[PDB]
């Protein structure tokens, strides 16, 4: 609870990689009867794991569903995982780091991965709008700090 460390948070990018993909078109040939703007649905899920000491692994899931009437258009889901060496983070600074800053790094890759699979189901272009996860999460916490003095040297 407000562990005042000498190092006010730490962030290092270690890896970004696709961990999971799903794209289902259950009525793929028959959806031709339901042709135009489908009801698209977003749902983001947060998964994490600690691989080693100060080495963490944040998975940002972006699920996209589409359907017209009572039948499906296309189903898609990506899990863009990313290894990050993070330490010093606490409370608000923790939640803002891995819950806003790190997802927003993984998001462009997850976005293009969905865009690829939709094209494999041979449907028109799906470009998701830029949501500022950083500022949106600051608004979730009303307002918070995102400014500090650097302290970095060989140790």
């Amino acid at each position: 609870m407000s562990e005042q460390n000498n190092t006010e948070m730490t962030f290092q990018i270690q890896r970004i990689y696709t961990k999971d993909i799903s794209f289902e078109a259950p009525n793929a040939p028959h959806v031709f009867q339901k042709d135009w703007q489908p009801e698209v649905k977003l749902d983001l899920d947060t998964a994490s794991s600690q691989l080693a000491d100060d080495v963490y692994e944040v998975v940002l899931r972006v699920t996209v569903t589409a359907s017209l009437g009572e039948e499906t258009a296309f189903l898609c889901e990506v899990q863009q995982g990313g290894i990050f060496s993070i330490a010093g983070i606490e409370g608000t600074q923790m939640a803002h780091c891995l819950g806003a800053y790190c997802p927003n790094i993984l998001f462009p890759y997850a976005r293009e991965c969905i865009t690829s699979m939709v094209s494999r189901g041979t449907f028109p272009q799906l470009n998701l709008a830029p949501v500022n996860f950083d500022a949106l999460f600051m608004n979730y916490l009303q307002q918070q700090a995102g400014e500090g003095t650097e302290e970095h040297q060989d140790a």
């Binding site: 703007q37 698209v40 749902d43 983001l44 947060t46 409370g91 923790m94 939640a95 799906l126």
Partner: protein, 40 residues
């Protein structure tokens, strides 16, 4: 002591469903009509 503490607290407790917004939408008018039939 069953009193344990995983460092991963402030994150994976609940998902965040983004409210879908897109005034221009995805689909417009590109589909099977001038499809791969005319290949003589």
């Amino acid at each position: 002591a069953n009193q344990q503490k995983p460092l991963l607290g402030l994150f994976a407790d609940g998902n965040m469903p983004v409210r879908w917004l897109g005034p221009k939408a995805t689909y417009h008018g590109n589909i099977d009509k001038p499809a791969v039939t005319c290949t003589p």
